[PDB]
């Protein structure tokens, strides 16, 4: 299937502008920083929790290996 | 504007845009090599053979 | 992996100089790191005074 019979669409208007009429980076920081924050707040409670737990299991288990290699008074 | 001058002079004809790029790469190669080299050899003053070779 | 020295060790069999292991005359690891005993291969005693290892 190629452009021409992909699907059937009715009543939709697409307006756009030549790249040479426009800025490459419209309001890049003023819109973009807020947007990136928004994006991160959205995902961090899904993504970050596991990696926290990794860091912890790795912290703990690395130091449990430390301790067990030492001597204790007995 | 400068860019206007450049467009009409160099970039409009595609044969010319190419001729620009090969010639500019030539001067860029020489320039960039020479400058980055000097940057490295100043960052590493004294430590290179080419800095100490006068002694032998 | 080093070569045990024969007729030596706490167990009068094999003592590794390396990480200090002690094999008996049976080759069995007695005192040291060496995970398991010495490696017992496949032999057959062809003649009364001949042996084949392989």
């Amino acid at each position: 299937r190629q452009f021409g019979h992909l699907t059937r669409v009715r009543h939709v208007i697409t307006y756009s502008l030549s790249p040479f009429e426009q800025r490459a980076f419209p309001h890049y920081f003023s819109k973009g920083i807020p947007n990136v924050l928004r994006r991160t707040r959205a995902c961090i409670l899904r993504v970050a929790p596991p990696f926290v737990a990794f860091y912890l299991v790795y912290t703990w288990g690395t130091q449990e290996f430390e301790k067990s290699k030492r001597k204790n008074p007995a | 504007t400068l860019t206007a001058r450049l467009y009409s002079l160099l970039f409009r004809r595609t044969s010319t845009f190419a001729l620009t790029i090969v010639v500019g790469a030539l001067f860029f190669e020489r320039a960039f090599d020479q400058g980055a080299d000097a940057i490295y050899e100043h960052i590493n003053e004294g430590k290179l053979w080419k800095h100490i070779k006068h002694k032998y | 992996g080093c070569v045990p020295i024969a007729n030596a060790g706490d167990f009068g069999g094999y003592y590794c100089p390396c990480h200090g292991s002690h094999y008996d005359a049976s080759g069995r690891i007695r005192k040291g790191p060496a995970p398991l005993n010495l490696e017992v291969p496949s032999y057959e005693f062809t003649s009364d005074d001949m042996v084949i290892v392989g």
Partner: protein, 378 residues
């Protein structure tokens, strides 16, 4: 009329990479396919150059490689590239597989299983390549791993000895691994051709998981520019390693020639196999460990049947998203464990991580799909 559309050869290239209707909204996660192609070309070129200088005799091999690094012109950069290249390939591979899982791309069954095979094939390739220098790790790594096939009852011993071509990993094994390592990338190229051929039947998935026929765009120039950008970033990365940190991802024992009499303190394979090493090491029994190792990879093939969600992609599946990232972190943990010596606490961390892995794929994420379904009144 127009050559790009008619000519038998150009038509294909046009249909494949210029006028291909791509979704408007594929993310950076769809970069990886092209990048994998680059990885593959990269290895073949750097590989070919190395092979003009290397020898696969036990006696000459270690030194022939170091000869590349000392006396061949630019041999050093080429060699380090082919080695960091192998890492970049596995990064690209695991990212690529990630996207498959999260966005439900695996619904494209033929594409997907070809892909599993690509993975296996690249795995074989890199396993055998790592042996080629004949360092301590190369040798003892290849020995331990190939020996697992000994645990196959009835035929194990015979089978491993036939692979070796003798009674240990020795002269005959290295020479044949060189041969295999050379021809395998070629076969990978064809399989990859086919991988694409099937993808081109459906076109691409996208992050919404929702059909995108109402908003496709010609591949060129949107995705030509974007792949190039990605390739730059891959090159940035590759060369950062080669030029700043060439040994960062390797083991130093591989600078010590292979010695059949002195076993290294900790034997590990390359990092890209560590998760599977750790699963294998968790099982007491040796055939158990083998079948677990095989299943940790082949399970990829089953994931299509384990899909429960009425939605294709995890974009709108919060519970599934959490579980997905759990699996990812677990694989980071499995990797950590696999790089560690078999002692407390790591033995038990590893066992847990191994359980968690299979638990997630076979029970938890299926369930979550279903819980989500009920939360949506379907």
């Amino acid at each position: 009329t127009n050559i790009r559309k008619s000519h038998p050869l150009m038509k294909i290239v046009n249909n494949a990479f210029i006028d291909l209707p791509a979704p408007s909204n594929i993310s950076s996660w769809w970069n990886f396919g092209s990048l994998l192609g680059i990885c593959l070309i990269l290895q073949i070129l750097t590989g070919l150059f190395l092979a003009m200088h290397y020898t696969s005799d036990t006696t000459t091999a270690f030194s022939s490689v170091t000869h590349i690094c000392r006396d061949v012109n630019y041999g050093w950069i080429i060699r380090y590239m082919h080695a960091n290249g192998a890492s970049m390939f596995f990064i690209c591979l695991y990212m690529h597989v990630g996207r498959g899982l999260y966005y439900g791309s695996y619904t494209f069954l033929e594409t997907w299983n070809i892909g599993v095979i690509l993975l296996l094939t690249v795995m074989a390739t890199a396993f055998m390549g790592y042996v080629l220098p004949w360092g301590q790790m190369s040798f003892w790594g290849a020995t331990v791993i190939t020996n697992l096939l000994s645990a196959i009852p009835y035929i194990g011993t015979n089978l491993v000895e036939w692979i070796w071509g003798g009674f240990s990993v020795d002269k005959a094994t290295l020479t044949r691994f060189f041969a295999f390592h050379f021809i395998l990338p070629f076969i990978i190229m064809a399989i990859a051709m086919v991988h694409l051929l099937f993808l081109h039947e459906t076109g691409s998935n996208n992050p919404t998981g929702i059909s995108s026929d109402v908003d496709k765009i010609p591949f060129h120039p949107y995705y030509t520019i974007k792949d190039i950008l990605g390739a730059l970033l891959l090159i940035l990365a590759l060369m950062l390693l080669v030029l700043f940190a060439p040994d960062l991802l390797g083991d130093p024992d591989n600078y010590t020639p292979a010695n059949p009499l002195n076993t290294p303190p900790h034997i590990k394979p390359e990092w890209y196999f560590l998760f599977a090493y750790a699963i294998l090491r968790s099982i007491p029994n040796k055939l158990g460990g083998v079948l677990a190792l095989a299943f940790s990879i082949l399970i990829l093939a089953l994931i299509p049947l384990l899909h429960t969600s009425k939605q294709r992609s995890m974009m709108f599946r919060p519970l599934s998203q959490c579980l997905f990232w759990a699996l990812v972190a677990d694989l980071l943990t499995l990797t950590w464990i696999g790089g560690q010596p078999v002692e407390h606490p790591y033995i038990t961390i590893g066992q847990l991580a191994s359980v968690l892995y299979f638990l997630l794929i076979l029970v938890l994420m299926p369930t979550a799909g279903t819980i989500e379904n009920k939360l949506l009144k379907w």
